[PDB]
Design an enzyme around this catalytic site. Structure first.
Site, short mmCIF file in Angstrom:
data_model
loop_
_atom_site.label_atom_id
_atom_site.label_comp_id
_atom_site.label_asym_id
_atom_site.label_seq_id
_atom_site.Cartn_x
_atom_site.Cartn_y
_atom_site.Cartn_z
N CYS A 153 46.64 43.29 38.54
CA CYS A 153 45.73 42.29 39.09
C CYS A 153 44.55 42.05 38.14
O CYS A 153 44.13 42.96 37.42
CB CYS A 153 45.22 42.80 40.44
SG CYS A 153 44.31 41.61 41.45
N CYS B 202 41.10 41.67 41.39
CA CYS B 202 40.90 42.98 42.01
C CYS B 202 39.93 43.85 41.20
O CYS B 202 39.17 44.64 41.76
CB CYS B 202 42.24 43.72 42.14
SG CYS B 202 43.60 42.80 42.93
#
Length: 104
Positions: free
Chosen positions: A29, A32
């Site tokens: 990610c 994130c």
């Protein structure tokens, strides 16, 4: 440290201990990584009442599917082992504190 690492095998046990804020993410990610230091600020600001439970969707498709998680970062507030609220994407620590607070 309030922040914990879980899988489908352990998620329910971890989320049973009061209000818990799970972080459906994966190390692949990008966004994130923006909220990760905000979760460290949440350790530093709420760790007396809160537990934070990171879960890697790439190995936990079942738990993600359990709530129809299809994007990350996704945030599941659980209380005493069941979902009590949901949120998606980045949020600042103040908004996250309110998201916790409404179920404290």
């Amino acid at each position: 440290m309030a922040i914990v690492k879980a899988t489908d095998q352990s998620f329910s046990a971890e989320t049973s201990e009061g209000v818990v804020l799970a972080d459906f993410w994966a190390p692949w990610c990008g966004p994130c990584k923006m909220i990760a230091p905000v979760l460290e600020e949440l350790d530093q600001e709420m760790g007396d009442k809160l537990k934070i439970v990171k879960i890697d969707v790439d190995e936990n498709q079942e738990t993600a599917g359990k709530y129809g998680v299809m994007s990350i970062p996704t945030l599941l507030v659980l209380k005493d082992g069941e979902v009590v609220e949901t949120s998606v994407g980045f949020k600042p620590k103040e908004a996250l504190q309110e998201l916790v607070n409404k179920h404290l």
